[model samples]
Target chain A: SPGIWQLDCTHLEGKVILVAVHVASGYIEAEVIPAETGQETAYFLLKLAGRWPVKTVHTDNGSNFTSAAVKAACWWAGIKQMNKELKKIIGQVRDQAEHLKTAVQMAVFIHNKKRKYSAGERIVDIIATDI
Target chain B: SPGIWQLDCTHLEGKVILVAVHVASGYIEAEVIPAETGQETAYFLLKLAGRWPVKTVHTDNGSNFTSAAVKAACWWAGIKQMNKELKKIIGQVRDQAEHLKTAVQMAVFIHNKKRKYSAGERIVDIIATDI
Candidate 1:
């Protein structure tokens, strides 16, 4: 049920927000990285391995996903662009300007608990029922 | 005990977030206004009058609160700066790009439910039990 992962970064309120999305479902991992270097990006993937069931990293024509740190993380676990929906939502939360970590958690929570697709079916349903 | 009210406006992710904080209780009202004009700010006060028991509007010696629209609203409701904690927390929520409104609600929920001052005293206890 879980296979592909997407990774990307965005800036908010002068902070670098690195995000990963599980395309298999709408689950998201978001945080503020200390830097935009590949090392930070790689560490994020390692951290995510402790939480998500990652396998292959989805990329776009060897462009944005070609970072060396991302490549190293792939050697350990897996990489790519994150969900746009998730990215947009993160923007909204960042606007709050407090509790960046808590806000990220809340955004992930709201995303995983969504029911926007099948008339009451939640994101969990896509995996639980394989629909 | 619910007497003083705080009104303020903040920009979040390209939106105007009008906030009203109940200084007596730390309960907050936050939302996106269509505009930043005095009329919008005034209308926010009018709207808050519907939900909160507003008696007075705290201001910064009449510099930011000297808007005519706010003065007009004073004839019906009231005016002021909001809480710094609330402002920072709102930034975090705005980071989430989806469900701006829902995310804001969650931020307010988290803020209103805080228990930071005492060992285990929530914001409500500032008035509910008058601790």
Candidate 2:
């Protein structure tokens, strides 16, 4: 809950797709990868953080996540690396690698626009009011 | 809770790796796939369930999980399809696709041998005594 983002990768038509979700804002970012390499993951994180300052990213202890290159990049970018509880949300949508970006973006959009906890304001408003 | 197995796929070095874990026994099975196809997933489940009678499988609502082929296969085997939870448990291990089988096996072994929920019995013994 302390300005952290949950990160994970999924398989889409034999390719790796990485995704990051802002824990508080329900904002999301994703990129399809040819392979699951630490260098690529780090680069993705760096780019994402450049757009919106991410304090920390939590992911499963996959080798791609722990590789030195990723760790170094996170450190250099002032983004912290930490460790998963969001599989169910993303698992609901499955599509080809080419469509993953749209699918994930749509999922995030719906998530942010929908009411949370059965009875509450939209996530967009909730996060807007939080800050 | 109802003799269900949680099933999902992970990206290991750009390849799709399927996994299944018995909710009650902590038993696990895994395989590497060139692609995420409904036919392949169903086949893997058939083979795994043959060795151990699976009552139901809980997986995310991915296309691979909901395809007619997979549904027919599960039904033919008398296994049910449902859906997620459990990323945290497997997220600790990081290895290449070639080593995913071994890594997942080792993780499951450790999981079954370890204590659960503060101070209970090992998952292996817990299941043995349950049945």
Instruction: Please tell me which predicted candidate would have the highest TM-score against the true structure.
Output: 1
> Across residues A1-131, which tens digit of lDDT does each residue of candidate 1 receive?
45576677776557677776667655565666667776666555654542233566654434545686567556634333345665566667665424454455445545654556421122223333331
Q: All models, DockQ values? A: 0.02, 0.02
| Backbone clashes in model 2, listed as residue pairs | B58-B83, B59-B83
* Shift of residue B110 alpha carbon in model 2, Å: 2.9
User: DockQ score of candidate 2?
Assistant: 0.02
Candidate 2 lDDT over residue span B36-113, tens digit each: 888777666655443333678887645667777678657756787601222344456543212444344434433433
Count the clashes in each prediction. 35, 2
Candidate 1, residues B47-121, lDDT tens digits: the string is: 455333356886443454568766765663423234566567757766542545545554665565455542112
TM-score of each: 0.40, 0.38
Deviation (Å) of B108 in candidate 1 = 0.9
What lDDT does candidate 2 reach at residue B63? 61
Scanning candidate 1 chain A in windows of ten residues, the lowest lDDT window is A118-127
lDDT (C-alpha) at residue A41 in model 1: 66
DockQ (C-alpha) of model 1?
0.02
Instruction: List the candidate 2 regions with Cα displacement exceeding 4 Å.
Output: A1-131, B82-98, B116-131
